[PDB]
């Protein structure tokens, strides 16, 4: 999964996925 693949994901996904790394 690339950062661009991530950049295409819905807003909730941006939060949820970055939540794993601890951005949210």
Curated annotation (Swiss-Prot):
Assembly description: Monomer. Homodimer. Associates with F-actin; the association with F-actin is inhibited by tropomyosin.
Tissue specificity remark: Specifically expressed in epithelial cells. Component of brush border microvilli.
Organism in which the protein naturally occurs: Gallus gallus
Family: Belongs to the villin/gelsolin family.
PTM annotation: Phosphorylated on tyrosine residues. The unphosphorylated form increases the initial rate of actin-nucleating activity, whereas the tyrosine-phosphorylated form inhibits actin-nucleating activity, enhances actin-bundling activity and enhances actin-severing activity by reducing high Ca(2+) requirements. The tyrosine-phosphorylated form does not regulate actin-capping activity.
Parent-record interval covered: 803 to 826 of 826
Stretches the record annotates as Absolutely required for activity: 18-21
Record note on domains: Consists of a large core fragment in the N-terminal portion and a small headpiece (HP) in the C-terminal portion. The core fragment is necessary for both actin-nucleating and -severing activities, whereas the HP binds F-actin strongly in both the presence and absence of calcium and is necessary in actin-bundling activity. The Gelsolin-like 1 repeat is necessary for the actin-capping activity. The entire core fragment is necessary for the actin-severing activity.
Name of protein: Villin-1
Coiled-coil intervals: none
Role noted for this protein: Epithelial cell-specific Ca(2+)-regulated actin-modifying protein that modulates the reorganization of microvillar actin filaments. Plays a role in the actin nucleation, actin filament bundle assembly, actin filament capping and severing. Binds phosphatidylinositol 4,5-bisphosphate (PIP2) and lysophosphatidic acid (LPA); binds LPA with higher affinity than PIP2. Binding to LPA increases its phosphorylation by SRC and inhibits all actin-modifying activities. Binding to PIP2 inhibits actin-capping and -severing activities but enhances actin-bundling activity.
Cellular compartment(s): Cytoplasm, Cytoskeleton; Cell projection, Microvillus; Cell projection, Lamellipodium; Cell projection, Ruffle
Gene that this polypeptide is encoded by: VIL1
């Amino acid at each position: 999964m690339t950062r661009s693949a991530f950049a295409n994901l819905p807003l909730w996904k941006q939060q949820a996925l970055m939540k794993e790394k601890g951005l949210f």
